[PDB]
Symmetry: D3
């Protein structure tokens, strides 16, 4: 439906695919269709084995994603609200589980599902003028896209609570100071400084073992949600997966022959 | 009495202040203060109008110096364990208070005192405030949840060092390690943190009471289990806001470009 | 052997035992023998009852521990790498479980197992010029010394992922900003500034009650890996252990007589 | 035609049956049956009327022999991992269906077939039905969630023995070790388990739909976390039934001494 | 008043404390008042020092507890229900946490709260003709006294689901068969068959060391709800508490002098 | 000399037996016996050829009575705990052995004895054999993992009663409460369980050793975390058997209608 565009970058960006929300008419809000195309796209990248890094961004300057579409919501019966929100929550959770490194490039507004979707990404970067927050309580509801879970895990319980309790919106610098994002940027002429940084950062990921990068992501993600000892067991099992791989050997041979490894993800 | 409870009014209505007032014992956690604090906390649990609670001291220069040492000296070994557990219990009840909580540290917060603050959702302290857990200097350990909440709030490393060294920090340092959310210059009235607390509390009053309560649950409960279960807890908590009158007011208020009128239902 | 030295300091520093890696010829890499010696050293202190605090450092300037010895690994078959690496993960985890406070003095390079060895310590102190990181992904593998579990817990999932995905190395300054270390300082002409500071901090731990210090480490370490309610029960059971000790009485007396306590560790 | 999804009527109205019909190849979890199955299970997650789901086979003697060995030999190791995970995935969705699920074992249930059965809430089998996880005899392990659900259903010890030995049990034995709740003697038609599963589902139909679904959520989620968190999950689940019309109907019906008639809301 | 009575058995039962429910006109239902009285009694006993075992039973023949009072519920605005139910769930959990061993003597009907209270006890004993179950789904609600939690734990998930789903009611015999109870016996001419058996069982616990018995309960209850490794640490910290006890040496001494132990709870 | 490590052969090739020979002490866990047990179990972890381990007593009528009371009464406060932790640490190492473990209870198994058995994957015991955890009668509590393994093995309620009453059971009773998986009648040789253990152990020899190892891993680890993470571990483990030569052999043997020839790798 054009609102979502999945691009597979070429040349020096080979290995990086991009997901760009494009829906100005609705401030990139999460409409019933946008999460289907989104869900559709995500399920596809799951299996896509040639991908090495996924960037999520907006093609509408000044806006990343305003969250759920309040308009469509007012037309939903109480017995329909829950199911729809849960759908939002699940598509975002699917994003948090994408096989490869993920980067959310915030160049504009990002509220509710907008920020929540970015919270599902591994790393977040934003212009200093970008605005983001979870303002659900002001509407007598709560973040329904995992924000009640990922925000506290990302910036700490106390700060996440203050933000949700006050439904306060932060700008790039504030977000960076609280830890919400790793890199804060200075918006440029075309309003894509964040996306730009994301591209650069992603390139730093391309030269590594595709198989290593994935199990490493698994070890980190799964292990953080269980006791450390079990977490250690998970690392061992992820590491085991890198042993019978060619890249493991192509890497040891790359340094012998003093040259950039030619990993294949094998 | 040694514990004051007051429901603020007007532009502060919806804020309940728990004020410790035992200048005599430096606000130490005595058997009585603990008994009263417990009643206070359980009552508030049921209160339907409270939208935020502030825990502060009504004695300048002191927040709470932890457990009363004069009493401990008169306790038999078979009494100590149960007593400290009674303390750990109340602190945890305070940690589970329904509405948002804010500790206003304008004085010395040691052991039980600091642990009480750690049980609150947010902490604000004056620059000159001194806080810390120095139990190891006494051959014991934090028994009010400190060994648990401290590492959770500032991280294992920083929390361990503080416990191992039994180091006391000031407001500036606590802000640096993330022990508190807001630090500020103590005013001449000796209630800087308290004032700031009030300004921050007011920022909570406008939100849907139901939403605020289950939002706290989703957070407090979600953090202590795996993310997937947390997401389920989030769904269950959201579910409760859907069939509320406030959720509609929220949408309507938006549609009529006006401030919402939430009633907690 | 001179490979791993164990210094039981005394008088003024009594209670402090230091572990110094001394494999200058191999950048202090975690060789087969070093592991075996390190393991024995740990297990030894694991029960030593005099100890009050352990410090892990290098006696080779500019180098802390380069991590796994890339050389021995070269002479390993795929059916052996796993077991070996798991052996490392086990010793490093043994270090994490030492009964007393542990400090890692970093006055030089800390990569892979080396940085992981430090993460297993309670406190990390380094010189702003010291470099550290987990570069496994560049070689097509992942941190096998517990790094996938300890790096996200110490500096947060997002940054931890960025450092591992990009295989970036940091200096003390950056490590301080990311929260990787708790103390950073300028290197001295002796190249042992971290050690100096580490030793100073260990001294602050000496006056405290020994039994109380150990159960406090158990409570914190253990409670951090289960729901908070259980941690509270764990705190309770750890505290109960200080109740009938002589030290606790000595503590209340010292306070009464307004004097310094004489803790015997019982 | 390979996958029949029927919405029964009459006294069984509210029961949805999913029958695997591929005698062609002993109902093996092939690339196709999987896609169709996933489509089916997904569809059911949103099925507003269903009150209980029964999974059975329409090929006498065979339930589901598990992963398609024929296909497995055609895929490179680079394709194995994914497909096996796809299985584990669809079976996991079956485990989280909103309503009560019943697996009727009237035939051979091996590997994925038995793992599919463990994803259901309740299992019933004919005494002559053979079931098991024999993965080890093929140098692999159960990849349909078997290593997790079997230990959970029958306990560690027994589950390990069954998996270490790759031993196949019969209805009676399966019933002996707890692998199933209901065993009965097979019949001429070869559908005794299915028939029993129907009479079990009918017992479920009369209860309030909402409470039933949230009851399942509370049970499934609470079991995978500490008891305390689980009690909070319970509370949040219970809360969702308070504001329902069915809840008042229940009390209304009790007052009038009549059977309640729940509509979901 | 006497709607709940606490008896401190003496003679050969000294140490045993019977908690009986005497509220016949409401089938020992959990009303505001009984819940309150019950909570105080429970709280009190929680700090009682001479208790060795607590037995919970009904003073009314043919009835244990029919759960919440439908009467009060009918007269209860929705915003009042959630709070009142959590209060039953909380008290039942305090019961689950009592210091010493607890036994539920089911001599009559045990429905909802009643059965849930019984599940909060460590051991359940019931007359063969006793009726027990959770029928909440028949009322469009779910168990709210812990049932969705304690039933699956006690008898397994599959069996727990089927009982809840069909809202089936079992008898003493059928309860023993599914593991809902540990001991089942034919009723007597007094109607206190389960109680008499519970007394005989309670007596078996008396000769043991009070402290050990307690920390043992802590270790079992707490370690069960967390990973085993952490569970093993909780056992360590609980064992530790028996080491400095005088009773520990009594057991040893009593053994040497080949004679019965005389423990005094310290 | 008091602990016999023996690698059987011919028909039993692959099985190794841990023999506790120490009648001059009822096989009590002495600081020295533990020493050896730890070193033997530490080496078995690296043994490539081992496919199954069997812990047995070479002393008839006695399996293991636990820690040696005598040495204990010669230990000061400070030594007890450290020592008991050594028992718990080894028994735990045992529980973590890479391959299947079968405990042959042909005689009295108490305290550390039963706890040593609880650490094995499967427990086989004579009908006359006696086993229990009687620590509470000694004013202490199970210190080899019993407060944890027993409750997970036979249920919380039963485990509580066995530990609270500190009663002893006989093979028959152990069977009905799930404490053991197999019960026999003791023979003239006084080694009934052992024999069963071997027969049972023979059923394991053929399966893929790699699959076997990662199967125990998945089961042991998944049972202690949430189900969802449990499935992840299973995937990660299934992953390890994919690139092996054994898996291919499995598909080949089947194809060529012949028994599988597995050999790790």
């Amino acid at each position: 439906e054009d609102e979502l565009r999945v691009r597979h970058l070429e040349e020096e960006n080979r290995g990086i695919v991009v997901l760009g929300i494009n829906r100005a008419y609705g401030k990139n809000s999460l409409s019933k269709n946008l999460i289907k195309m989104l869900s559709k796209a995500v399920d596809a990248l799951k299996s896509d084995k040639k991908v090495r890094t996924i960037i999520i961004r907006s093609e509408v300057p000044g806006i990343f994603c305003a969250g759920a579409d309040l308009k469509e919501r007012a037309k939903m019966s109480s017995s329909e609200v829950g199911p729809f929100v849960s759908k939002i929550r699940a598509v975002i959770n699917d994003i948090a589980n994408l096989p490869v490194p993920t980067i959310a490039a915030i160049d504009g507004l990002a509220l509710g599902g907008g920020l929540e979707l970015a919270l599902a990404c591994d790393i977040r970067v934003a212009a200093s003028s970008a605005k983001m927050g979870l303002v659900e309580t002001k509407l007598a509801i709560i973040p329904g896209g995992g924000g009640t879970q990922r925000l506290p895990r990302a910036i700490g319980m106390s700060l996440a609570k203050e933000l949700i309790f006050s439904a306060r919106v932060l700008d790039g610098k504030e977000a960076k100071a609280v830890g919400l994002i790793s890199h804060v940027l200075e918006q440029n002429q075309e309003g894509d400084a964040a996306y730009r940084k994301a591209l650069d950062l992603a390139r730093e990921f391309l030269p590594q073992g595709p198989v290593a990068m994935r199990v490493a992501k698994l070890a980190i993600n799964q292990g953080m949600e269980v006791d450390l000892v079990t977490g250690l067991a998970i690392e061992e099992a992820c590491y085991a997966q890198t042993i019978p791989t060619k890249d493991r050997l192509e890497g040891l041979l790359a340094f012998k022959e003093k040259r950039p490894p030619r990993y294949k993800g094998e």
